[PDB]
Symmetry: C3
Subunit: 496 residues, 3 copies
Amino acid sequence: NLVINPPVFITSILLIVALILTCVLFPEKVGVWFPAAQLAVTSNFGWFFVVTVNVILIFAIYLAFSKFGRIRLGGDDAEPEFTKASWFAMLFSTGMGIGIMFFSIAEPVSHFFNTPRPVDTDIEAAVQAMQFTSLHWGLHAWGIYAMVGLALAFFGFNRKLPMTFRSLFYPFWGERIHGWWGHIIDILSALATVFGLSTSLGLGVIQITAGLEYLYGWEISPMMQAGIILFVIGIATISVFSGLDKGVKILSNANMYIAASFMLLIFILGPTLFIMKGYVENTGAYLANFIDISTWNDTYLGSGWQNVWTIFYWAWWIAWSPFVGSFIARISKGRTVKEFVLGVLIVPGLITLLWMNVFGGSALHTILSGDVTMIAAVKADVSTALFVFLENFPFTKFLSIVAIILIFSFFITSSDSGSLVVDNITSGSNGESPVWQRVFWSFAQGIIAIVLLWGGGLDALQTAVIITGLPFAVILLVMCYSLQKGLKEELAKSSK
Amino acid sequence: NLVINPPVFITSILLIVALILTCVLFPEKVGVWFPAAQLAVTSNFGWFFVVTVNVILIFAIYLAFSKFGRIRLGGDDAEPEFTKASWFAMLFSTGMGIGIMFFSIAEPVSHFFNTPRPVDTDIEAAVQAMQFTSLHWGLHAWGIYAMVGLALAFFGFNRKLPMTFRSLFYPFWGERIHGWWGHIIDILSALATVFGLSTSLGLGVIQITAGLEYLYGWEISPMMQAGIILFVIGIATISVFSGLDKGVKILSNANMYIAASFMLLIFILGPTLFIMKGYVENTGAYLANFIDISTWNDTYLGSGWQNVWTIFYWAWWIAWSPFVGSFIARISKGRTVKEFVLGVLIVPGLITLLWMNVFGGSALHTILSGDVTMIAAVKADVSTALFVFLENFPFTKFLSIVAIILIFSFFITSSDSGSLVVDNITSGSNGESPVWQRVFWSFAQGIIAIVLLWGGGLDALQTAVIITGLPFAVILLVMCYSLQKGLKEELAKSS
Amino acid sequence: DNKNLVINPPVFITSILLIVALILTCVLFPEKVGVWFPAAQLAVTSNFGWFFVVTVNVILIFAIYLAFSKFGRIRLGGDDAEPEFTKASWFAMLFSTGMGIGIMFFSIAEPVSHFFNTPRPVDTDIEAAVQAMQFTSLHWGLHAWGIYAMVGLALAFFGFNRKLPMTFRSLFYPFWGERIHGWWGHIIDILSALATVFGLSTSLGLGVIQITAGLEYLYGWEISPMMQAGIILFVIGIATISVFSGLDKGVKILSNANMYIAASFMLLIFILGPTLFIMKGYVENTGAYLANFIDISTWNDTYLGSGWQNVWTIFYWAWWIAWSPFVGSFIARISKGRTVKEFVLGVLIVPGLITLLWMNVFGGSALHTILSGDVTMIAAVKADVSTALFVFLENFPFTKFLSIVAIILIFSFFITSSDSGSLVVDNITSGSNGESPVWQRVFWSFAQGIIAIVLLWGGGLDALQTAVIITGLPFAVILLVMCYSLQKGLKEELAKSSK
């Protein structure tokens, strides 16, 4: 069929097509325009990104510990479909850990040899690297995700509105969200979702290509990368055509089991005691200097370090929100607002910090021992780092194959989930859309990832996600205030 | 028409005249007695000032988030006279600030080239300078002001007692505060208020004289400074006797609008992106190291740096507390204790930190760029610093004239407001007395400022502030506990 | 053997056999024990310092949470129960039950040791002094009193609201219910008795070491280990004699006199020392301790790996954990009719603040003397750690009188420690609350003295550290389980109430 939203489907399709045509028809003009635009946006609005993420996290904490914390999503009589532990495990499944696998070793090592701030000795460099990795992957990312998921769940369960970003502004837009005011927000949400998913797909493909090159010595041309992307998208859409939700839903739990086994293997075969001590000490130091690193803007040095690491991560989380928050809201019916915020903030953040310690802190322990091949490997390219890390463990080939397969399956699950989210947002059917729409959205994500990889690689992904996450940072602030207003309305309506 | 409180008015006049006579008749003896006394008080009770300001701020925060936060000033009838958005702007003490114009640039530059604690890099020196400027002008000053305004509002609105400092001890001293026990507290409050006002007037005159000298090289003599003070006080006297609003209360938000326009111009013509990033980062670092710098006492180095900056600022806020808290309480009827404390704490402190960033952080950016003329200017005399800062902007002369006019208007507003507060303290009932007493109190403030400026300048103002703020720090702690008891008994009374 | 036995088997039997077995191992295998105890202590510290840090942090966070949760309104001993003493007197009594022996041993020695042997690298001596004061505050501040507050709160709630016996097996009633009558509550009771006995033996050994060092410093005597054993026997004598001749109030009055004498000693050192420096340092050091609370509480020395925590931080956490039953018993005994929030706040803030004030008055004064240029105390602490206070007292008027007063204070603290710990261990072992014959608690005091003698002969302070660490390793797990058991019990009481 053609179950679409005419103002959203059309606008998103021609915007994506126009960007693709600009990228391909202008091979060299875009290669200089994109870095300039990304640099301008980062330099002029890093303070705004920092303020946005801090305000969103503070708002989530305040909502958890206020009179709104007793509000139960889906109604007062609504009952959770899962237990607390299973819900926590499921919450540490919407994180889409392709970036986790890409950065777990690369980011701490890069911060070690390219320090955010000047340090005296290597010990302080390692501590700072762990602190900034914790900042980038800790409370702020999951706070943004918790806020967006809470808004979506409250407006799709308590208010019965469709779980689309246009409805999230109902409290002070009234019925005005039906044309060129909720349409623009819907278009921006679809674009930000598509570009965050394309960034993740490109990261996964880059890491898979690097792993194949490192293991089997192959020469993976960009045409081979495009063929890989097309093959994976096709094999993911085959499940959508025939056999929906299987074996894709079970893949989401198989991925978590495999990732837990991988992390446990690295924890046991690595410096286990060092990993535990470093986990405790690094979490304590991250919480101790939380306000210092969260509000840091590199004002006086002006090194431009945040333009690639911190501002990029904030923009990535903000642009990824309409997807991670959507899947967080889908599985969270019957939870109270306080319990929801706590269970999205603490446990997923703690597990992310544990993974970051087990991998990056072990890498830094290896580096501090005098083994600096990993620093050179990261400097040469950021993609191979994990595999170089696995060179320091038994069963290096088996571990690398397992990691590549894990990245492959994460890519499949993220592609399917993002196609579902983008189709639901754009069409507005919320489940009544045909299969071909989801297949086309998967194709669009794959094509955008291919085009970005050809026209810059990782830099193109960073540029796209930052550019599409700035206006969505504004939208997220407005959405946070709208969610507060809606929670006030619900509290006033109840407690008669 | 002599409506006065005898053993407040007479006693305060006697002490003021006695100090004036001691200062004039003993030119050189006072010039060595006052610095020694100030050094002794600062060295021996800097820890006490630190403890007092920390306890007052913690008490204000606790009262905001306790069961007393639901208590509404003026009873449950509510009906505040102003909206919250306008109340936040109206909450800037009695004015946007003379001291803020004096120390917007001079203090950060001084902390840059005279660091409170040892630092290794100029970047760290600038960060520390901004952190200590934020400490001195941030949450502690407005916490003291919020506590005093809350006490005055609660005891003048919920209990209908006169808005004098002796009533604030009614829950503790019972009815006993009506002779030689509330009289002493009233005398100390009047003296501390008068000396804080005199310090502000002296700072304003010093900065105006420095600006005139910098702009035109007029070589303003101390006699000309006294003439300027007399002319300003005469202008304030002309404002009164004619129904006011000529005058005073008309330079608001006219003063507020002029100050906001000045800050906007400096923010735009200066480094805008640097100012925004520095504001965010400096506020975050000031909150991150709040307990480290608030409780810091310079114990191990013993450099004596706090004697001129930190302890002086705490004593200044403590002594200024009656004056600021009077109007903080006056225009805050019908607001809950929690809302009042939050609105006096966050927004005024945040905008003060924004002003400090826009001016001092821009100056520090200029210094870190390589231009170190402001360091030399501040070392020669802090008074010219702002004007030297304005040398790095377009329309330097116009901006300097605007700043001088702003200081002049703040002078008039603060003088009239302080005269009103001191008249209320020494007379009572808030209706009396005839305006001649207010004129006399304005004359007294001007004369005290003149005498202190002749007998030491800024150092004399700091000495008077510290000496009159130590016993008032003790009084402020006692007042905080008495206000807590009064709030508890009001909550218990409302069954 | 007859009616003169109110022991609870097999806690009596198992505890006595374990103590006797360790005593025989120590006295029959000198080289074996001398090579095994340091190795076992090093292994435990290295492998579970992170766990000790996590345990103390979780216990303190749980205490703060219980203070400010819905359980803060629960009144121990019933909703109608009234406090036995006033708030100020109760606060004064709460700054006790640590016996002060550790605080007199480490008042000067710990800050000086952290000054010349820094936990972390520092550039200037000012930073070294600040770090020494910060880590001293960490070791003697909120974490120790948080452990004590949690244990005392559990004991008070389960011995007053639930009327269960004030042993550690009852604290797990909400989790196992009725399984605590054999080999499950028995093992927990045995471990609690052993940890209490070894913590009290550590305190007694510290007191004896300090007294011997003070006598050597003052009168130049050569106190042989035989003389140390004689001193311990004489104390576990005269104290047993006091116990025999109905002197239950004679130890309470002794404790009150000890508190007054310690307050006078602290005031004298505060006045005759750098008073202004002490006040400024107290304010600044408390502020710095609170400012870097999470930094130093969670610090594990992961990257340097210097092993510094194995002797200072992990030892202190293990000591507090294995020493918390004895402290919490008397913290709970005097806390009837007080709300959970009020109890936690009054055990956390005021005793911690007074301990930090004492540590400032002594250690910060010593650090001021060192920074002035007098480094005799550094050399004295390096030579031996037990003379430091007396060397410190060499910088004050009436040095001999102050040293004699300190020695007498340590001796009286030793008597109070012996009596109180004997009572606690007798109550735990025999089960009945103060119903066993006096000979049982006399034998427990004798056992404490013998264990202290054996540990002092077989290593000295290192042996005491090893014993307390080994016995506090499983008790950290026990305390972690007991925290959640107490939370479940508080939830059960809240649900049972509001009827």
